[PDB]
Every structure is written in structure tokens, then in C-alpha cells.
Design a protein around this motif. Sequence first.
Motif, PDB file in Angstrom:
ATOM      1  N   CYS C 148      12.300  11.903   2.191  1.00 49.87           N
ATOM      2  CA  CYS C 148      12.809  12.623   2.983  1.00 49.87           C
ATOM      3  C   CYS C 148      12.660  12.321   4.606  1.00 49.87           C
ATOM      4  N   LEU C 149      11.401  11.704   4.837  1.00 51.82           N
ATOM      5  CA  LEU C 149      11.068  11.454   6.141  1.00 51.82           C
ATOM      6  C   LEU C 149      11.551  10.153   6.615  1.00 51.82           C
ATOM      7  N   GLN C 150      11.595   9.159   5.426  1.00 52.31           N
ATOM      8  CA  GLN C 150      12.263   7.872   5.453  1.00 52.31           C
ATOM      9  C   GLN C 150      14.051   8.086   5.685  1.00 52.31           C
ATOM     10  N   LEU C 151      14.509   9.044   5.138  1.00 51.73           N
ATOM     11  CA  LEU C 151      15.919   9.221   5.433  1.00 51.73           C
ATOM     12  C   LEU C 151      16.444   9.802   6.905  1.00 51.73           C
ATOM     13  N   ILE C 152      15.367  10.776   7.327  1.00 51.77           N
ATOM     14  CA  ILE C 152      15.472  11.294   8.646  1.00 51.77           C
ATOM     15  C   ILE C 152      14.811  10.634   9.656  1.00 51.77           C
ATOM     16  N   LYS C 153      14.096   9.561   9.521  1.00 56.14           N
ATOM     17  CA  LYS C 153      13.444   8.854  10.488  1.00 56.14           C
ATOM     18  C   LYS C 153      14.409   7.854  11.301  1.00 56.14           C
ATOM     19  N   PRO C 154      14.439   7.852  12.594  1.00 56.11           N
ATOM     20  CA  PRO C 154      15.334   6.858  13.128  1.00 56.11           C
ATOM     21  C   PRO C 154      15.034   5.337  12.927  1.00 56.11           C
ATOM     22  N   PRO C 155      16.076   4.630  12.572  1.00 62.08           N
ATOM     23  CA  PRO C 155      15.669   3.146  12.154  1.00 62.08           C
ATOM     24  C   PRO C 155      15.161   2.327  13.274  1.00 62.08           C
ATOM     25  N   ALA C 156      15.703   2.665  14.641  1.00 60.36           N
ATOM     26  CA  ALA C 156      15.095   1.800  15.689  1.00 60.36           C
ATOM     27  C   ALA C 156      15.689   2.525  16.802  1.00 60.36           C
ATOM     28  N   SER C 157      15.119   2.154  17.957  1.00 59.35           N
ATOM     29  CA  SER C 157      15.372   2.748  19.426  1.00 59.35           C
ATOM     30  C   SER C 157      16.647   2.177  19.718  1.00 59.35           C
ATOM     31  N   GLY C 158      17.000   0.885  19.495  1.00 59.50           N
ATOM     32  CA  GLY C 158      18.594   0.688  19.924  1.00 59.50           C
ATOM     33  C   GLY C 158      19.677   0.850  18.716  1.00 59.50           C
ATOM     34  N   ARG C 159      19.116   1.414  17.569  1.00 61.14           N
ATOM     35  CA  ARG C 159      20.132   1.785  16.439  1.00 61.14           C
ATOM     36  C   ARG C 159      20.373   3.278  16.273  1.00 61.14           C
ATOM     37  N   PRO C 160      21.318   4.072  15.933  1.00 55.47           N
ATOM     38  CA  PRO C 160      21.626   5.466  15.703  1.00 55.47           C
ATOM     39  C   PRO C 160      21.093   5.630  14.532  1.00 55.47           C
ATOM     40  N   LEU C 161      20.979   7.027  14.081  1.00 55.25           N
ATOM     41  CA  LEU C 161      20.493   7.579  12.971  1.00 55.25           C
ATOM     42  C   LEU C 161      21.530   7.299  12.033  1.00 55.25           C
ATOM     43  N   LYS C 162      21.318   6.760  10.625  1.00 53.84           N
ATOM     44  CA  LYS C 162      22.091   6.558   9.712  1.00 53.84           C
ATOM     45  C   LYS C 162      22.835   7.937   8.760  1.00 53.84           C
ATOM     46  N   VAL C 163      21.873   8.853   8.510  1.00 51.29           N
ATOM     47  CA  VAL C 163      22.239   9.988   8.011  1.00 51.29           C
ATOM     48  C   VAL C 163      22.580  11.099   8.730  1.00 51.29           C
ATOM     49  N   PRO C 164      23.726  11.822   8.556  1.00 49.65           N
ATOM     50  CA  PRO C 164      24.285  12.548   9.467  1.00 49.65           C
ATOM     51  C   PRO C 164      23.428  13.950   9.725  1.00 49.65           C
ATOM     52  N   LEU C 165      23.731  14.611  10.800  1.00 47.62           N
ATOM     53  CA  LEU C 165      22.704  15.671  11.351  1.00 47.62           C
ATOM     54  C   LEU C 165      22.878  16.810  10.312  1.00 47.62           C
ATOM     55  N   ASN C 166      23.809  16.916   9.622  1.00 47.07           N
ATOM     56  CA  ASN C 166      23.987  18.036   8.696  1.00 47.07           C
ATOM     57  C   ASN C 166      23.095  17.817   7.584  1.00 47.07           C
ATOM     58  N   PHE C 167      22.739  16.403   7.220  1.00 52.09           N
ATOM     59  CA  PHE C 167      21.781  16.152   6.273  1.00 52.09           C
ATOM     60  C   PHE C 167      20.429  16.330   6.632  1.00 52.09           C
ATOM     61  N   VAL C 168      20.417  16.014   8.099  1.00 58.31           N
ATOM     62  CA  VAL C 168      18.873  16.038   8.689  1.00 58.31           C
ATOM     63  C   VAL C 168      18.517  17.617   8.616  1.00 58.31           C
ATOM     64  N   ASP C 169      19.640  18.602   8.914  1.00 59.98           N
ATOM     65  CA  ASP C 169      19.494  19.958   8.726  1.00 59.98           C
ATOM     66  C   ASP C 169      19.011  20.594   7.220  1.00 59.98           C
TER      67      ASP C 169
END
Lengths: 268, 89, 550, 395, 395
Positions: C148-169
Amino acid sequence: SAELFKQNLTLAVNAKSDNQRRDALAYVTNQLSANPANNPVGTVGVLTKVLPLITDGASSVRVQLLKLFRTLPPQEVRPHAEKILLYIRGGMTHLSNDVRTDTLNVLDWLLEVAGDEVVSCPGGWLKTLNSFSSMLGWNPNVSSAMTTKGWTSAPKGPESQAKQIQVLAKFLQTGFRPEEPLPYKPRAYWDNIYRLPTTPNPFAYLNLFGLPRDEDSEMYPDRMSRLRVFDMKWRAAITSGMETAKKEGGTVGRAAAILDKALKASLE
Amino acid sequence: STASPVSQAASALLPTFFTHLPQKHLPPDIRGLLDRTAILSHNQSAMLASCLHPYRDSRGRYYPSILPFLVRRFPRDESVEVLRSNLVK
Amino acid sequence: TAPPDLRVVCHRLASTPVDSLPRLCPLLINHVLRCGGPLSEPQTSETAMLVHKFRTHITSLLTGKSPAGRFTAVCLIKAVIDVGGWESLRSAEPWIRGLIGVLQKPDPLSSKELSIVTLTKLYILLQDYQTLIREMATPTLPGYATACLQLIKPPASGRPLKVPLNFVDTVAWSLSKLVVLYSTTMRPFSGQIKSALRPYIAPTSSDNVVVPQSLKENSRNLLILLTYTAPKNGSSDEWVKAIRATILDCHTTADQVFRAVRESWESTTGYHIQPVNATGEPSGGGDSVDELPPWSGLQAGAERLTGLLEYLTAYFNNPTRAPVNVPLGELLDLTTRLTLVIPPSLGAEDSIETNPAIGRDEKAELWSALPDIHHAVLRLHCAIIRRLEANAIPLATDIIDQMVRVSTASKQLPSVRETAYILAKEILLLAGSTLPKLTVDILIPLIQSSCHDILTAAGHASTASPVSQAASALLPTFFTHLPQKHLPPDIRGLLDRTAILSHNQSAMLASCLHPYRDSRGRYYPSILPFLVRRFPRDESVEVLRSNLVK
Amino acid sequence: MLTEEFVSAICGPPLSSNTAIAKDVGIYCHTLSPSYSVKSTFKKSSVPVNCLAVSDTHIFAGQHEKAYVHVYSRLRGNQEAFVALPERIRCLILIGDILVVGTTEGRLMLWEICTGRLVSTPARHVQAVSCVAATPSHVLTGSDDSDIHVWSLSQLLELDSAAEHEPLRTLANHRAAITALAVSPSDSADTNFCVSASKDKSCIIWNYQTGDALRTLIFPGYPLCMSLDPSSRAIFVSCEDSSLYVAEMFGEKPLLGPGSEDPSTVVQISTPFGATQPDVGPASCLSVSYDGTMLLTGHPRGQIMRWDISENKSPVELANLNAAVTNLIFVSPFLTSKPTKTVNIIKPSQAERAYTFTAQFEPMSFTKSRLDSLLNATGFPADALESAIVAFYQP
Amino acid sequence: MLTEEFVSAICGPPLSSNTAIAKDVGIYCHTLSPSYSVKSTFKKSSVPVNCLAVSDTHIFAGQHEKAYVHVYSRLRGNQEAFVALPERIRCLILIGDILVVGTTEGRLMLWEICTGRLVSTPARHVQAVSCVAATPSHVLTGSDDSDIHVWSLSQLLELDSAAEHEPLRTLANHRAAITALAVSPSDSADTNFCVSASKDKSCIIWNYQTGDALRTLIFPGYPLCMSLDPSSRAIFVSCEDSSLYVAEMFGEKPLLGPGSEDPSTVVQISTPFGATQPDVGPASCLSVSYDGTMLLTGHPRGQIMRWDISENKSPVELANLNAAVTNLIFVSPFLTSKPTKTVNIIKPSQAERAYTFTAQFEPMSFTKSRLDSLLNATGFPADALESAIVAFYQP
């Protein structure tokens, strides 16, 4: 006189001497007959002390207990029928035939003073039927226990049996008495909400603070449910019993005749 | 435990069994079961309905009212404040 | 003789292709929920054979290459753990690792979300059985948390989050449900959650990301409940320190928000207002881990303050493991400071003191920003009333003053009026029967506004509105929990007329139960003929008819 | 299964030399239903009349002679706290988590057990405060000066309140020391009442929010203790003649209501419901059961009587605690959901501090999410399934 | 504060030869508040006593000594129907969509105006059904044989029931023709009552679900009509002696309640609230306004008289209609949302057909959706806005 009453009751319930117990019980009976107000411990206390004594081996002492019962006030006996009926179960259950006969007399007393409370109290109907059918020997459970599997065994006093059938018939007609409604009370509906309940032992049908009840321990206050459970569970067994008692004849046959009249009126 | 939809639908129906059902044809055991259900479920509507629609026996005597339980579970609710109207003056 | 539901399940699973199995999932779930008996039967009968085949086919779908089969497996596993009881619980050890593998493998987001819900339900149901936590929950849980923390962890400072915020919810909701039960196991994961949920606590317009409301609420709940993982029973100390840090952040943000208005507020706790530079746009925030993401602009400071107030609301919305020291005095001082600055009437901007250096555009942005801050303060007060119940009687006098001041400052906003009605109902239900004449007189405009809203919605000056519903809920409270002796007769007449025209049965019952007393002593007529003619068969109306008449 | 429980508190030295009953035990916790059985014991307390308070976390017991209250934790089964109050304690009740203490000096302390805040009213009573009753809104204090003072709770307890606290009303148509006070649970201005017993053999029913005397009843002896029935239909009072009197407000001759007579008319009550033998003694304390059918009376000789109002006029002895049973308090058999739990209690202290509240936050699920429907629903909801299926089939 | 309206019906030939009122017009509709004016008229009818019924859409008016009911469309202003019945009409009322008619032959008829069914009962009465009243569950018919029969609405209106309908009870204590009937708003078995009025100078209050006669009231003259006050406290009764009497059931002495006497003991009323002159004559019909402060009477000489119950002032004449005002019916000032609107009625026919219910379906939002909240809410909701922005920014 109150101290004399208490010490005589204590000696009657604790002493080892049959003659001293019968004299103390006769003294208590005499004071209760002369004045019902002469009861420092109360009717409930007197019943609580003398109810273990109904299984005494002394028939005369049991006779003075019967006299003490018959001089106790029935309106005070009525709210506490269940404990008396449980001790009556013990008296039915005890092996001595004289104790059984005297407890049958006590049951006749209790029916005379309070029929509705006995037939409506928790366990007052089906456990009474258990006791009667057990000590008349018409019990389907006892018959099934005696019967074996595969094998086929060969097929197998009077005053006592006549008394037992008479008390059973009286109990059945008491439970199946016809009932008539009361007239209209103009201020009953609002007093039911705005006044304390006058019914002895209220909220018994809720049983919120008590042990859960099976079919045997459930209340059957009304005649329709009493007749329903009776026709569901006990019609055929005591029907065969009264037919057998009719074939016996005699005073047993007479008691079977009153039992037949009561069960025919039940079928009506 | 949580409240299932079937439990909520039955709870909404419990006061109706008192208000809009003939109690003279009702067996006493069902009335006792309804009263136990109302008291142990804390349905103030059902307890008020049971108080206002008492059960007649074959004798003609009314059963005792649930009201001591209702007044101790909801002492200051509208259900008991309307029953206390005889002291309004 | 197996159940026909079980026969239908086995036949449809055998015949239906895996690619069309997700379309057949709704009826299969209903049939499995109907299959209560054989699935709960502990371990030959056709029932046992079909149950064994059904479980084997579930395991085959879960371990298969088909994502559709995996989705069907997740649905069937959720149904089985719902209906089958302890046998289905103890026969689910490969199922937990399969569900985690569904999360790890590149499966679609709906399948991942349903796997997360199924795993959360599993770990909740295992709490009843003490051993199954030891063999089953304890080893598999760190892998699930890591996934779960790998899914919601940001990949990089210059890259956006892959999973949707509804999934982070959904991930945050699952972790919020699991921290309260498995604090020791996910103690090492508390560091990554605090870094992952940092942007979603108080998002501003400068974050350039539209953060979901449910994501905000779940992130707030998770970072509040993360005190459960504190070592050596530091849960209460961390809770107190975090809520006091939130109050301090509220004060420091309120400095930059309210730099325009010169305040007469003084602090009982002892907080002093730092000087704020007159030049430049108001800025706040930093890149530090403990502090929230930076914001720029007065409006962004307003959403920062609103989000921090909602986080303080979530503090009273979430439970605690151990008794804690709630800073009620600091919260009351903070709300007093935020409610002593009020928007004006038309033309009173000159009357309200303002800093000369602040421009008119910044001023107008501020007075537009104030009503939302006041709304957040009132919601926080409602949460405090709800949590404390009779323990906010010491605070009852101040919240009345703040509510009346906020409502009179902004009586034109329906949301502020609705929140004022809800808070008024809570306070008057709490301590309303002993309010003095002065308090009854200063809450009279609330009564007039509520009656006006109810009559406007009823048409006797529309349709259903939240403001109308809140005012109609508040309406019986004006009779039940307010002193009738302190009420003016016109107010009582307006209340009775409003109740009659709105056909509010509860308000009319209350008005009949509370006759009005004047100074002279004459009996005012009751509204009982209206109540009996509009609601004739109601049980309480019958009691009133049979009692008040006598 | 519903079990009815009650907490008893005894005071004074033992009166019989019995090794079975321990001397130092002061508080007992019992079950009345389905039968008598001593659940638990609490040690070293001599608790006089009206100095016991029971809540689901703690038992508060004021001490005879000493200006001390012993706080016992029912959760942990031990003595949590020794708290010392500034003055002698004569009466003690609990409303919420706020302890009301009436002194011999005439003062009232409101001590909030969670915030550790003590509020002391001025000595408006010239002698000792005998009895106190409370609502969530009002506090009624009846004292030995033949005076009953009505106080607003919200006015008594505020932040930064420096004005001297004053009672709202004073009811002084009595002529002797007030023995007992009981208050109806209704907080409405028109339906509330209180009933007060004093040493002048009189009980007055008052509207304490309007200050009007509804009814006056006169008994042959002065009433020692009082309790209303739960459904507010009747008053059960004990007297110095060892008698127990019942008074129904809505009988064929109603004390209150539309059919009632004038308030100036005084009712004479001379018919006793029950009587206790002098070797048992007069009922020092009384309590009423949850259903209201039963009432427990504690006597200074040590016996506990159970009275069944419908069934038996004569009382039934439960047990003898070998000491003067000064307090009997019933506990509700139903568990009430309270949003905070008072595990520990903050001692009273006088110092400058921010207003801090100490309690444990229970889970009530105030926060609702759409994932909770999927979690708590059997299977999944149909809309949740179909949304998942549509988003799954969609790329 | 309210606009009350009332409908009057006239009967017989005009008494005066020359008048401003048209001799043809038979039904008037007036507004009482705030000013008296004739809002509408309906042309040709001769309505006997208790032969008028008003709904939100129609007015039903039985004819004099004819088996005809004229139906007038209140939403269109004309006469819609000339509905014929098998027997002549003595009385008629309307409940829901069922017109209950008591005929001249002792029969009860129920005409469902939305389906066309005409259910007729066997002649349990032996003379003409004088008066009829309806609850949502029961129908009470009092006839000239001193008998009132109570019928159950469900077993009266059962679809395929071919067995003969029978009354549940027979309230027969009267000794003369039943003039009037009124029913309490309550419908519970223990809290309801019904008040009769017969030609033996008597009014009996019954419980029509148990059959018990709760009270007997003697008037000096035989009652003509009554009306209950809205609070069910007073029974306004017109008598033959040109007098209106007020019998207060729950006043200083309760006729019904805890403080009442026995039901056998009879209460006599001899104090007239109001009197009318011999030229005015006794009031043919009585009615009470929605507020209950105001009362209207119909008199055979054509005048309508307003009486102030609260102020006890002298009655005032509204207008003269030149014919006997037999029926006066108030209309409720508020509108009740009825699920179906009866625009047109179906004439009674006896034929083999499917059960068809004819009405119009009104929009009251039985369905809900996420888009309905978007439409009804001012602007968009914040969550839907946020979802739309997320979906827009999603690639």
C-alpha cells in the motif's frame, strides 16, 4: 406473644422431636386461627419456614401443616403460589406414598385458594402434567425409556390411584374453567398508565431479569393457549390412562368418570 | 453490532404492530415478545405505542404498562414529556 | 442434497468464461450469500464436494493469470469471508497472500480497491479470534502495508503520483481502520504515512492539485490515529503535542491572514501576535517535514486556516487509545480570536479598523475569506459539543456569543445560517433552560431569521432547503429549551404562527406543552385546535387532547 | 440476560463479633436479580447518609468525621484516590462527571472530576446542608436552616467567573430541618417538580423553576428518607415510626393533576403500606429498582429489606452486613453509550492553568465514509459492484 | 391570518317573491375571512339535510325525494354529472373517494367515484337511514328505528366478497329516530368516541369499537344537529326550542375521564349558550370553523348566523338566501397533498370488467438521483464539483 410465635416456629422447623413439632405447629395454627393479625414474621415468612417441612416423615406433622395452610389467608397465599407449587413438585417426587397423599391434599388446598395463579404461573401447567403423569405411570417419556429396540417384551393402591386421578381431574377442570369478562370500568385505561400496577408479580411475562424459559417453564395464563398446548402434548396419553382406569373400575373408575367429564368438557 | 437494513425495516415496523393491529385478536405470547423487543431495543415509539395501546386479557384486566422502562431510558424525550401533560396547568 | 444456490454457483463457474465472469459477479455474490449453511460447515456429501470444488476454483481464479478471474476471486472471497464464519476465516491463508499479490501486480484500480476492502474486512474479522491474529494477520500484514505504501508513495520529486487520489483515499481509509487494531505491527510504517499524507491535510489553491474531500478527511483521521503506534505508551503525549502544534499553526496562519485587521484580542493562554511585514503578499508554510506545504496568497492562507480548523474538528471526530489532555482553553481562545474579526455591513469598512499599508484588493479578499473561517469555527464548536456533551456547559456562554456575532455579521449566507441553526440547537439542548434575559434578548434575531426561513420555504412569506431543515429542527427547541418568561409576546406569536403554517407537529406539541406567560397574567390561547385538525390520529396529539383539555 | 445490581455503603463500627464478615470493608457491590450475591468489595470506608455516589467508572464515598472522599475504580477494583476537600462533607451526589458536595458550613462545592476544577459557592445556608438533588440544569440544596436553595448549574460553573454565586429561588414554607429531596427527571418549566421531606412531619411538592408549592402532605412521624417511583406515579417514604408510606399522585383522590384540590389544602396520610419491627429499626436509606416493582431499605441495625409492592407487604431480609447500611444505590442493567470514558480522575487543585479536559475518547463512528458501506455490507453493495465492473471493463 | 371558505346549499321553493338572489341558484360558495363575499355559485339542486359533500375537486349534492346526486366540478365551475342511484337518498357523506349514501329503504351504498363500483348492503335497517358518519376504518349509520349500526370499511369494500355484509355491532339504547352523529378524530380502540343525537331528547356518547355507552345527555328539546369543537372539548347542539347548547365534556366536571360518574347516571343540560327568535327559527345545521373560535348556523328562513364562541357576543346575520339553508360545510384553509387528483368521475355501472382505478398522477418526486441534487441545489454541490474537475483533468 410475637417472641413466643418466633421461637415456636423455629422449634417446629428445627427440632428433632415429632411431638414437640406437632405441638408447636398446632400452637401456631391456633394463634393464626384466633387472629390472622397475630403474625409477626408475615405469611411469606411462615410459608418460607414451613414449606421444607411438607416432606416430613411424620404424617401427623404433615396434617398440622395442612391445618396451618387451611388457616393461612388465601389472599396472601395467592402472590406466592410458585414456591409452594415447587415444594408440591418435591412432594409429588418423593418416594413415600403417604407423603405423596398429603402433598396431594396440599395441592387440593392450593387449587382451592388459588386456581388461576397456579395454572398461570411459570411452569405451573406442563411441569404439573409431568408430575401427575410420572406418578400415575402414563408418561410417554418413561414408556419410551422402558421400551427397547428390536426386542418385544411381554405385557405387564386403589385409594391412592383414585386420589391421584381425582386431583388430576380437578387440576384439569381448574385449568379449563370457562371464563367471563368483567364489566366496563370507566377509569381503568388512564389508571393503568398513571397508577402503580395492582397485579401481583407484574412484568412476569417479560422475564427480562430471569432465566430463559422453555416450553415447560413458559406461562400459559389463558384458556385458549392452555387448551392448545394440552391438545398438542397431553391429550392421548391421559386419554389412554382414563380408559385404563375405566377398565379398572371401582373408586378408580369413579375418578376416571369425573376425569372423563372434565376432558369431554375440554373437548367441547 | 451494526444495524442491518432488515433490522432497520423491522424497527420501523415495530411501533406499527401496536398502533395499527387489533390487540384483542393477538395471542399473549406475541404481545410479550413485542414488549420485550421494544424494551431491549430502546424503541421509544414502540414503548409509547405499547403504553397507549394496552393488552386486554380474557379476564378484561389491562396488562401493566411498559412506562417505568420508557421513563428511565428516555427521561426527557418528547415521548414522556407528552405523557406528563397532566401537570401542565 | 446440496443447495441449488451452490449448484448454480458451481455450474456457472465451470461453464462461464473468465472474461465474462465479472459481468456474472452480481448474481454469484447473491448466491454465495444465500449459501450460508455448507460454507460454515466444518470439514462424503455432495455439499462438501461442491464446497471443496468452489474453494479450489476460487483459489485457481486468484492464482490465475486472468485479471478478470482475479476480480471475480476478490468478489467471491469477500462474499465467503462475509457468509462462512470461522471455517472460511481459517481456510483463507493463501487467499490473503493472493489478495496482496493482486495489489502488487499491475491489475486495474477497481480490482485493487476491492482487494483492499476485502483485506481490511479480513483483518477486522480476525480480531475476534485471538490465535488467527498470530498465525495469519501478523506475518501477512507488513507485506500488505508495504504494498500500500509503495502504491501511494510518490515516485520522484519531478514526477507525479501514479495512482489516483481516490485510490489514495481507499489506502488511507484501510490504514486508518488497521492502526487501531495492529499498532505494534505497523509501528515502523508510521514514518512513511506521515510523509505521504502531508499534502492532503490542509490543501490550498497554491498546491495546484484538486485534493478530494474524502481523501482530506481520511488523511486527517489517519494522522490523528497514528498516535496509537507510539512506543512506550506515548499515545496521549503525541496526541496532546500534535493538537497543540495544530493550534499554534492556526495562530501563525491567522497572523498572516489577519495582518490587515488591527485586533483588540488578548490571549488568556499567553500567545502573542508576531509582527507581520506590511510589504508583499502574505505568505506562510515551509518545506520542513513537521510543517505543512507552503502557500502563497491571502485566499490560500484562508483555505489553510479552514483546513487546520477541520483537522481540529477531526481531532474530536476521532477516538483515542488512552485518556488525553484536551486544550479546551486554547481552543476557546483560538475560536474567540477567529470570531472577534467580523465582516461589516454595507459601509462599515471605514468603521472597522484596518492597517493603512494594506491595499483595497487584499482587504476585499479578506472580507470575502472571513465567512468560511467562521463556518469552520462553528463546525468545530459543533464537534466539541457532540464529543463533550454536558462537559461543554462551562464553555456554553462563549460559544453563544461567538455564534450570535458570526450570524449577525453574515446573516446573508445560507450556509452560515444553517450552521448557526445546528449549533444553536445543540447549545440550547445542552444548557438552554437557564439562559438569562440578556442572552434570550440577544438570541432573538436568530429566532426571527429561523422563522423567516421556515415561512419562506413553506411559501407563506420555495422548496426543501438545508437551511429550512435546520431551522425546522431548531423550531421545537425554542419552546422546549428556552425561558418562556423572557420571551417577548411578539416572538412567541411569530413562533406559533410559523409552527402552524409549517405544520410542524413537534413544534406544535411543544407549544401546547409550554403555555406562554406574560407580565399581566392572562392565558394566551393554545394552538391545540390547529394540531388536532391537522394531525388527528397521532398518539401524542391524542394524549395532549385528553390531558391539556382536562 | 439482564442482571440488576446495587452498591451498598456501611458506616460505623461493627455491632456483632462475627469473624465471617470483615470489619474494614465499607462498600459492597451486589446483584438483586436473579438472586442475592456479593460481587465485589471495597475497603476502608465509613460512609454516612447521602455521601455515596456511583457511576460506571467510579464510586465516590465521603468519609464520616474526616473531610475526605475515597474514590474507588470499579474498572480496576481498587481504591484510586484519596481526595481532601476544604471543609466537612455532609452530603454528596454526582451529576455527570461533576460532584456536588454540601458542607456543614453551608457551602456547596462543584468538583469536575475530569478537569480537576473546584467551584465553591458562598455560605448562603446558615447551618449544615443536609440533602442535595440535581438535574442537568438545576441543583436543589435543602439544609438545616429550613431552607431549600435552587441554583443554576450553568451559572454556577463557567470559565473566568468571579461574581459571587447566588441561588435563583428560595423555598422556605417549611419550619424544620430538611431531611430529603427528590426531583422529577423532567426539565420542562411546566411539568417539573420536586418533593421535600422535613423534620416537621411534612412533605411539600414544589415547582422549583417557578417557586410554587403544589402540595402539602403530613405524616405521623418525620420522614427520614424518600424516593419517587421511576414513572413519577408515587412517593415511597420511610418514617421514624419504622413505617413505610406510599403516596400516589393520581389515585381516586389525586394529589396533583386536574382533579386535585387547592394547593392550600393539606393532605393527611395515616395509612402505612409497611412496618418494620424495632429490632430491625427504621429505614435509614431507601432505593427503588429499575422496574419500580421492588424497593430496598437499609436499616442501621445491619439488615437489608426487599419490599415487593404488588406481592408482599411484609419485607424480606436479603442479608445482614454487620454494620449500619447507610447507602443503597441501584445501577441500571442497560449499558449507556457515553462519548467519553473517565478512566482516571484529576484531583482538585487551585492554580493558574489553561482549561484542560481529561478523558478517553470512545469510538462512536461519527465519521462516515462510502467505503464503510462496502466494509459493513454483506458482500458488496450493488452500486459499488457495478461501478467497479464498469471501471474494470473501461480502459 | 387564514382564508376560510364555506359552501352552503338551499332547499325548497323561495320564501320571498322578490329578492336580489336568483331563484335558480341552489349552491353558494362563500369566503368567510377576511371579508364575507360569494366566491362562486352552482346552479340547480335541492339538497336535503346531510346530503352535501365537498372535496378539493367536486361537490356532491343529493336531490330532494329523488334518487339523484348532482356532481359539480369545483375546478371547472359547472355541473359534471347527474348520477342516478337505485334508491332515493336520505343522507350522503364523502371519505377519500368513496361516497357513502344512506338510502330511504334501510340500505348503505358505497360509490367509488374513481373506479365506478357501487357496493350495496342488505337492508339491516327497517326504516330510512337518517344520518351517516365515517372513520378511516368504520362507517356508522343511525336510522329512524332507534338503531345505529357500525360497519367495517375493508369488508365493505372488498373486491370479490360476495357474502352478505353485516354490521359488527348495534348501538341500540335510543328510543326514537337518530337525528345526528359525530365522531372523534381518534381511531384507536380505547381512545375513540361517537356522539349520537335522537328524538328522545337525548345524546349518547359511545365507544363504537367496544359498544359501551359512555355517557347519556338529556336536552329539553330533541337535538337537530351537533358539531364537535376542534379540540374535542365541547359539543354544540341545536335543539327544537330555537337554542344552541354547549355541553363541555372535559370541563369542571368531566363527562368522560377519571373523575366522571357512572355511565348509567344521566347528565342534563339546561343552560342555552345562544337563542334565536321565533321568526329566525331553530337552526337546521351547525358547523364550526377551522380555528374553532367561530360557529355558523343555517336557518330555514335563509339567513346564516355567525356566533362568536370565545367572546360570547350576539350572533350576526351574514346574508339571506331566501331558502332554507339545510347544509353548511367548511373547507380547510390548508391544502393537503393528495397522491392522486380526481379530475373526472366514473358513473356507477354493474358490468363484468377489470378493476380500473381512474385518476391523475401528480409529480411529488418519488424518485431521486445525483443529477436532481445538481438541479435543485443552488450552484453545484462541492463534491460533485470536485469530481467533475477531477474527471476533466484526468487524461
